[PDB]
Design a protein around this nucleic acid. Structure first.
Lengths: 59, 58
DNA sequence: CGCGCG
DNA sequence: CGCGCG
C-alpha cells in the first residue's frame, strides 16, 4: 500500500531503470518485500523490468 | 541429524533416485527445509541430483 | 544469486 | 514453479 506508492515515486522521480538495491536503500525494506510488490506491479503493466534486477516506470 | 542422517538413510535404503515429494512424505518436513539440507549435502559431495527434483545417495 | 513462489 | 539464496 504505502510501499507501492514509495516504490512508484522512486521509479517516477528517476524516470529510467533503477536497480533493486537502490530501492532497498530508498524504501528501507528487504529485496523480497520489494520484489513481491514489483512483480505484481509488472503483471499489472504499471512497471517494466528492462533487465534482471532493474525496474522502470511504465509497462 | 538436524535432518541430515534421516535424509541420507532414506536415500541409502532406496538405492535409486528419490523424488523430493517422496522425501516430504517420508521426513514429514517442508520442501524448503529438505532442499536447504539437500543442496548443502550436494555441495559437500554427499548426495547428487541426477535430474530436477530427484536426489540419490553419493 | 536472476528468486517474485502464493 | 526449477527455488537451495546464506
Amino acid at each position: 500500500d504505502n510501499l507501492e506508492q514509495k516504490i512508484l515515486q522512486v521509479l517516477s522521480d528517476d524516470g529510467g531503470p533503477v536497480a533493486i538495491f537502490q530501492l532497498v536503500k530508498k524504501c528501507q525494506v528487504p529485496k523480497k518485500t520489494l520484489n513481491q510488490v514489483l512483480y505484481r506491479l509488472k503483471k499489472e503493466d504499471r512497471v517494466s523490468s528492462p533487465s534482471p534486477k532493474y525496474w522502470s516506470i511504465g509497462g
